[PDB]
Design an enzyme around this catalytic site. Structure first.
Site, short mmCIF file in Angstrom:
data_model
loop_
_atom_site.label_atom_id
_atom_site.label_comp_id
_atom_site.label_asym_id
_atom_site.label_seq_id
_atom_site.Cartn_x
_atom_site.Cartn_y
_atom_site.Cartn_z
N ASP A 4 -2.69 -2.52 -5.24
CA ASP A 4 -1.77 -3.60 -4.81
C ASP A 4 -0.75 -3.91 -5.91
OD1 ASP A 4 -2.91 -3.97 -2.27
OD2 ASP A 4 -4.05 -5.75 -2.92
N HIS B 16 0.85 -1.22 0.00
CA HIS B 16 0.00 0.00 0.00
C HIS B 16 0.87 1.26 0.00
CE1 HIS B 16 -3.68 -2.28 1.85
NE2 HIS B 16 -3.32 -2.74 0.65
N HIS C 40 -8.72 -1.57 -5.79
CA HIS C 40 -7.73 -1.91 -4.73
C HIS C 40 -6.72 -2.96 -5.23
CE1 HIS C 40 -5.95 -1.85 -0.85
NE2 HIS C 40 -5.83 -3.18 -1.00
N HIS D 62 -0.36 -11.17 -5.10
CA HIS D 62 1.06 -10.96 -4.72
C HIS D 62 1.93 -12.10 -5.30
CE1 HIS D 62 0.18 -7.37 -2.63
NE2 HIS D 62 -0.44 -7.94 -1.58
C1 LIG Z 1 -14.17 -6.97 13.89
C2 LIG Z 1 -13.33 -7.22 12.66
C3 LIG Z 1 -13.59 -6.54 11.48
C4 LIG Z 1 -12.82 -6.78 10.36
C5 LIG Z 1 -11.77 -7.70 10.39
C6 LIG Z 1 -10.97 -7.95 9.23
C7 LIG Z 1 -10.37 -8.21 8.22
C8 LIG Z 1 -9.66 -8.62 7.04
C9 LIG Z 1 -9.34 -9.97 6.83
C10 LIG Z 1 -8.66 -10.36 5.70
C11 LIG Z 1 -8.28 -9.43 4.74
C12 LIG Z 1 -7.53 -9.87 3.51
O1 LIG Z 1 -6.45 -10.45 3.58
N1 LIG Z 1 -8.11 -9.61 2.33
C13 LIG Z 1 -7.51 -9.97 1.05
C14 LIG Z 1 -8.38 -9.50 -0.11
C15 LIG Z 1 -8.14 -8.05 -0.50
C16 LIG Z 1 -7.06 -8.13 -1.57
N2 LIG Z 1 -5.71 -8.14 -1.03
C17 LIG Z 1 -5.15 -7.07 -0.45
O2 LIG Z 1 -5.75 -6.01 -0.30
C18 LIG Z 1 -3.71 -7.25 0.01
C19 LIG Z 1 -3.60 -8.25 1.16
C20 LIG Z 1 -3.97 -7.41 2.37
F1 LIG Z 1 -5.36 -7.38 2.50
C21 LIG Z 1 -3.42 -6.03 2.05
N3 LIG Z 1 -3.18 -6.01 0.60
C22 LIG Z 1 -7.40 -9.39 -2.36
N4 LIG Z 1 -8.10 -10.24 -1.37
C23 LIG Z 1 -8.46 -11.51 -1.60
O3 LIG Z 1 -8.22 -12.03 -2.68
C24 LIG Z 1 -9.18 -12.26 -0.49
C25 LIG Z 1 -10.65 -12.41 -0.85
C26 LIG Z 1 -8.53 -13.62 -0.29
C27 LIG Z 1 -8.59 -8.10 4.94
C28 LIG Z 1 -9.27 -7.70 6.07
C29 LIG Z 1 -11.53 -8.38 11.58
C30 LIG Z 1 -12.29 -8.14 12.69
ZN LIG Z 2 -4.15 -4.31 -0.63
#
Ligand SMILES: Cc1ccc(C#Cc2ccc(C(=O)NC[C@H]3C[C@@H](NC(=O)[C@@H]4C[C@H](F)CN4)CN3C(=O)C(C)C)cc2)cc1
Ligand SMILES: [Zn+2]
Length: 296
Positions: A238, A79, A234, A261
């Site tokens: 990334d 990011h 988004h 990634h």
């Molecule tokens: C109370 C409470 C509320 C919210 C949460 C939370 C959360 C959360 C959990 C998992 C992820 C998460 O890895 N998403 C991946 C998503 C978004 C996107 N990656 C990114 O944004 C990268 C990796 C990091 F996100 C930062 N750059 C692509 N992506 C997917 O393909 C997933 C669906 C597997 C992102 C956010 C926990 C507790």
């Molecule tokens: Zn991201």
């Protein structure tokens, strides 16, 4: 009229939490000499451990881009590297008090505001660009990531989740504003995954404050989305971050088909290795260059 390298005019300090660690982290961006590149420092460690933000230092690609040197990591760099790519920053030290870059609001937006508030400094050295000369494609399964020659910089992405809440966007950055149309695109997670992720020590800092939280039908975030196509915007945010691990701004096109990634980094390694497919170029006259940067 030469396109010059850029660092920060002033030091930037920010405070946040790791998405994954849930750890409070102190962040400092420092100006850096010509040809330094972007260099992360774990200042919490004695001695300090520094990792150039370069493809060869990428160790983990599991739910973030991770730089590694021996037993030491910096998690979730994509990011901030996105913000520094977007604003044309060649040289910067990134100091962290913890192993994870702070998630902020889940986008590059807070990073671009803090940097642009501090301002950029042009330095007396040609900006180096990586120009794509040949097509470079990698695939694994139905996923795919391609570099294509293009007289400019542009990123196309497509995702294909089967989920009510949906997925294609293309952005030319000499025609479209990174700041306005991409930087504010937040990371997203699905309710189902958060439970499982909590287990394998992940998403410990996640909330509606730093992520679009999606159940089976709806975005849970009260105030909704910043863009109709926020999810795929988004993915582009990334990809721009990952692309910058090249260590120089690209003159070419990137096409992601369900890439992430892992496959992004596959492409970077393949491109670096196929030296017939790219060259380093500078532009002695900005007025004839294919790309252009906001005033510093
Ligand atoms: C109370 C409470 C509320 C919210 C949460 C939370 C959360 C959360 C959990 C998992 C992820 C998460 O890895 N998403 C991946 C998503 C978004 C996107 N990656 C990114 O944004 C990268 C990796 C990091 F996100 C930062 N750059 C692509 N992506 C997917 O393909 C997933 C669906 C597997 C992102 C956010 C926990 C507790
Ligand atoms: Zn991201």
């Amino acid at each position: 009229s030469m396109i010059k390298q850029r660092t920060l005019k002033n030091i930037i300090r920010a405070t946040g939490v790791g998405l994954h660690s849930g750890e409070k982290v102190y962040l400092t961006l420092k100006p850096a000499p010509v040809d330094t590149g972007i260099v992360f420092s774990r200042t919490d460690l004695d001695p300090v451990v520094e990792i150039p933000a370069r493809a060869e230092n990428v160790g983990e690609t599991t739910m973030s881009t991770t730089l590694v040197k021996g037993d030491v990591k910096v998690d979730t760099v994509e990011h901030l590297l996105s913000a520094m790519a977007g604003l044309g920053i060649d040289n910067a030290y990134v100091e962290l008090s913890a192993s994870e870059v702070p998630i902020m609001d889940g986008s590059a937006g807070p990073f671009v505001f803090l940097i642009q508030s501090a301002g950029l400094q042009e330095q007396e050295a040609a900006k180096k660009f990586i120009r794509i000369k040949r097509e470079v494609s990698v695939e694994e399964g139905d996923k795919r990531a391609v570099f294509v020659p293009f007289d400019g910089f542009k990123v196309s992405f497509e995702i294909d989740f089967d989920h009510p809440v949906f997925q294609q966007a293309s952005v030319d950055f000499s025609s479209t504003s990174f700041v306005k149309e991409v930087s504010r695109a937040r990371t997203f997670g699905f309710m189902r995954d958060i439970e499982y992720l909590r287990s394998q020590n992940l998403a410990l800092g996640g909330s509606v404050e730093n992520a679009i939280v999606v159940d089976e039908n709806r975005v849970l975030n009260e105030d909704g989305l910043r863009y109709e196509d926020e999810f795929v915007k988004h993915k582009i945010l990334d990809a721009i971050g990952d692309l910058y691990l090249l260590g120089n701004s690209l003159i070419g096109e990137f096409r992601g088909f369900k890439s992430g990634h892992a496959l992004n980094n596959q492409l970077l390694r393949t491109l670096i290795a196929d030296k017939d497919a790219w060259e380093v170029v500078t532009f002695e006259d900005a007025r004839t260059a294919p790309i252009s940067y906001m005033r510093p």
